[PDB]
Symmetry: C3
Subunit: 314 residues, 3 copies
């Protein structure tokens, strides 16, 4: 299948500006060029242009509900279009709120997909439980069937249709969960591997586990929503919500490497890369480079090396 | 049981001043306020005032024997009082020599306790084996029954009564043991997991192993003596004897997290935090924050998150 | 068996000068003195003097073929002399091209040896596959029987006799392999554990694996060829080709400690320590100390501690 890059330069999902420069930063680092050197046909769709909704009064505590809901509906339509044509979508964030459009779109064409959410957070706060307005912390609430109607309808999200059930999502790398979120994942019986489970089992046993939970009964396409903060701030410092005690660069690459091997990766997001949040330029390069490394790993790049078949060396 | 904070700002246990500022620094980071947010009643006893013994001539190579012995006698009495009232004592060091008073006190009330010593060192040098006078490196020698009389009586420690035998202590994180100490732990048959076993088994199997060694025959109260240098200098740099190749922040929190789950934590020490040894202020903050995080983990804080029961979110 | 230190201050194996100062740096750090404190007799043979071959025109893309070929022949002779006398040779590089002489020499006296190559790279490019002239990235191509005649005869290497077959070498720590090298290791069926396998199995299971592969059928002397870049750049930054995502200091010491326990260590190389490549002096000290620590570990130094037997402490 070919790969289609889609930039989502949107940052109204959280309080600080910056994530909109994520797509630019990743491209400037040669992400598309590097991708072209793999056994995949790469088409770069370019960055979506989001029309800013005027007089976007907060719902209640929820902020920018219309701009976010609109931007997502727009993104969902695009993602649905490429998936339709049989291509693998890669969304360059942009903050996590944009995972609503990405997974929705993807689900329109692939209704039986599962989601592997790699993050330091669950991002499952409903507009009620949220302690801030911020929508980047609420993606999964708007996507879960089991949470349908457990909160008021938000302006701009009328189009949203809960596509995944609690049995289709696995979390990896949790270490910063709110009481409400914790209550929800505990109540609904959601599967997760927080840093304490990664510490106990090892990333090898962790991936083995997630694949038999998700793919044990039957094979289905996978959507990997990757948040750069799921790794330790020492590796990906330039994000808005860094939390020490994260996954290591190695563990990061092991996750993506294992995913490639299933041959089921259908959708992928690289979110939260905030170019303006690094103390020094080296921190921006460090974050960007690991974000790219993660991407190429999903598409065949192995640490043991790679070589073009049919070519005879020697 | 309630929790009682007891500050032991003592530094005569070793050659450099500074560890006396450990309690002040931990407090300033909000250690007590944060503890209060847990499902525990927190009472802060304050910092003990130690009277300096005049003309404290070295025993032999042993330094400040009277000031260290006196200070511990004082601390042992306090710890015994609180343990007697059914509370959990938390001693904020201060150097390791103060572990003599802490464990003694705890043992007068709970004679069947076991000790889990997390440190890069065994701190088991007798006044004979020591290559320096420093008592901070001799705590366990004064507490072991099997070492009673294998060395001369030291001034200021007449009150000491060997409370634990070689089968009641487990070491975790060893990577800097002296020949003599190595001789002792090898001879006496002491159980330990140096960095090489942590590397071979993994922290999960390590904790699993210590719990069945210590609690396999019968449950008994646990005294966790935690030396901040048991973790890698990259995480807790502000100590006097850092040794590269340590336990990681995650490994540290996994230790504390497992301990909480036994529900047997009865005594806890957070030793060696020397605010004056960080090259830059960030190093002090880093050491202090991880010391605090370890403390809260012991009292319930989980990485997967926590939530107040009886409260309904949604 | 005694130990014989042999310095190979050579750097024509790669484009940058610097590795010739490796032996100097290692010695200045007290490597020989520290070695003398082990249960081994240490003789320091000193540094080899290499005569520079005039008018050393590039073979094809291959650079300095004569200087490197000669230097190795000289080193092979010395190594064979000490091996003959029943000693364990320790070669202090110097770049990896000097592994050609080291292993060859050792193989003349011990034709049944196996090689454990710890490195970020396979260093198996033939003069054809190389994308640069650099011989430091070609050692193994000149030593494998299975690659004999798969490339033109290079000037200065006529004396070389392929000594090890594809079943006698195991790689550990791979994370930067070229397409050709990857083609070769995949084709010839060479056993390896790249970073991804280390991540999956853990270093304990990895060493257990290499020992049964290599020593399962019958015991034979081991040649440990250790390249300082097999550890992460955070521990050994002063090398020419650093690659993030490496083995940790702990993982490093576990390798060496396991090798000592076999009692089969017959030859050892400590290569690539480039004193002139550290940003700050602390980076040089860091690289050098871990190289030293690795060496002592091979010769008995344990993390749990060591003590002289027959001596009674207490
Ligand atoms: Mn996140
Ligand atoms: Mn210590
Ligand atoms: Mn290398």
């Amino acid at each position: 299948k070919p790969i289609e890059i889609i930039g989502a330069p949107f940052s109204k999902g959280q309080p600080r500006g910056g994530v909109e420069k994520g797509p630019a930063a990743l491209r400037k680092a040669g992400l598309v060029e590097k991708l072209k050197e793999t056994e995949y046909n790469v088409r770069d769709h370019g960055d979506l242009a989001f029309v800013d909704v005027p007089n976007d009064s907060p719902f209640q505590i929820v902020k920018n509900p219309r701009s976010v809901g609109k931007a997502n509906e727009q993104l969902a339509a695009v993602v649905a279009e490429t998936q339709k044509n049989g291509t693998i979508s890669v969304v360059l964030g942009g903050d996590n709120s944009m995972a609503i459009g990405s997974i929705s779109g993807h689900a329109r064409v692939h209704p039986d997909l599962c989601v592997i959410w790699v993050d330091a957070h669950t991002d499952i706060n409903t507009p009620l439980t949220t302690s801030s307005g911020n929508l980047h912390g609420q993606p999964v609430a708007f996507l879960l069937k089991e949470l349908k109607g457990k909160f008021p309808d938000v302006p701009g999200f009328s189009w949203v249709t809960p596509c995944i059930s609690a049995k289709d999502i696995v979390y990896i790398g949790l270490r910063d969960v709110d009481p409400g979120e914790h209550y929800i994942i505990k109540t609904l019986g959601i599967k997760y591997f927080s840093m304490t489970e990664v510490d106990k089992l090892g990333i090898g046993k962790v991936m083995e586990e997630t694949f038999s939970y998700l793919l044990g009964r039957k094979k289905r396409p996978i959507h990997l929503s990757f948040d750069v903060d799921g790794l330790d701030p020492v590796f990906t410092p330039a994000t808005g919500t860094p939390v020490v005690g994260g996954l290591s660069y190695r563990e990061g690459l092991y996750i993506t490497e294992e995913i490639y091997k299933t041959g089921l990766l259908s959708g992928l997001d690289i979110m939260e890369v905030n170019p303006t949040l690094g103390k020094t330029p080296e921190e921006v390069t460090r974050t960007v480079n690991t974000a790219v490394a993660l991407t190429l790993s999903c598409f065949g790049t192995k640490r043991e090396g790679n070589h073009k078949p049919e070519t005879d060396y020697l």
